[PDB]
Design a binder for these strands. Structure first.
Ligand SMILES: [Mn+2]
Ligand SMILES: [Mn+2]
Ligand SMILES: [Mn+2]
Ligand SMILES: [Mn+2]
Length: 224
DNA sequence: ACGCTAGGGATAA
DNA sequence: GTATTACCCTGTTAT
DNA sequence: CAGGGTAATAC
DNA sequence: CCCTAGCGT
């Protein structure tokens, strides 16, 4: 039998590796529900071969979140993360962390929910049928945020920065959240692209939904 | 003075 | 030589 | 967030 | 995602 131990160094196309993968069949219901959220948020899910198999690319600033995600995809990630030191068009140094799963036929069940055009997409009823509270957490940790950023703000209102999507797509996400969790929310706008504003009248309900799953280094994102 | 938005910047995707 | 593919790399901007 | 490129096995 | 200049109490 094969352990990640003995494959995590071998060349990409190596037979031992490819046999490693053939043991894994699907994604445990944690890795799956988290990925609905990670993909709504900050994760790249890509297919270099026409959808026969997808992988997941990661990039974040927060080495703790990065480390935590990797520990959740323990089986699917082979290497600890590659610190990326980049220089932007203003001579400024930016420090991110990067990583990736290997491709596997198991990541399609995720992919086919979003990727159509070869472009990330939201289908109707996605939230009803798959989004769960654990999903909602990683969505928040990735793209979520304050409405009111002035300190001394007693405001408890939350925004989910969905500017990647079409207004029609984001509208469907909203109907879902509204029906399925009973959150008082609704779409606003920012740079002419949609965001989901959750009214503070439900930061009770939204918080108790995502507090079970929220990692510590990501607590600086909430209100107070 | 001080709570609130919407406009907009420099990353953190 | 072709096929393959995880790790990196940069392009680029909506977050 | 999204694509490109290559070095490392396998044939 | 986050900050902040400006209107409105
Ligand atoms: Mn996003
Ligand atoms: Mn994020
Ligand atoms: Mn994001
Ligand atoms: Mn983006």
């Amino acid at each position: 039998n094969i352990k990640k131990n003995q494959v995590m160094n071998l060349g990409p196309n190596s037979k031992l590796l490819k046999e490693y993968k053939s043991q894994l069949i699907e994604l445990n219901i944690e890795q799956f529900e988290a990925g609905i959220g990670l993909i709504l948020g900050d994760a790249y899910i890509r297919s270099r071969d026409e959808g026969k198999t997808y992988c997941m690319q990661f990039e974040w600033k927060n080495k703790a979140y990065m480390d935590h995600v990797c520990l959740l995809y323990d089986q699917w990630v082979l290497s600890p993360p590659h610190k990326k030191e980049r220089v932007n068009h203003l001579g400024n140094l930016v420090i991110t962390w990067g990583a990736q799963t290997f491709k596997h036929q198991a990541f399609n069940k995720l992919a086919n929910l979003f990727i159509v055009n070869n472009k990330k997409t939201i289908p109707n009823n996605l939230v009803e049928n798959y989004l769960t509270p654990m999903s909602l957490a990683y969505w928040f940790m990735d793209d979520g945020g304050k409405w009111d950023y002035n300190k001394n703000s007693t405001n408890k209102s939350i925004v989910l920065n969905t500017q990647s999507f079409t207004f029609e797509e984001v509208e469907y996400l909203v109907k879902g959240l509204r029906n399925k969790f009973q959150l008082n929310c609704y779409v606003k706008i920012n740079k002419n692209k949609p965001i989901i504003y959750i009214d503070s009248m439900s930061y009770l309900i939204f918080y108790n939904l995502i507090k079970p799953y929220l990692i510590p280094q990501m607590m600086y994102k909430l209100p107070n």
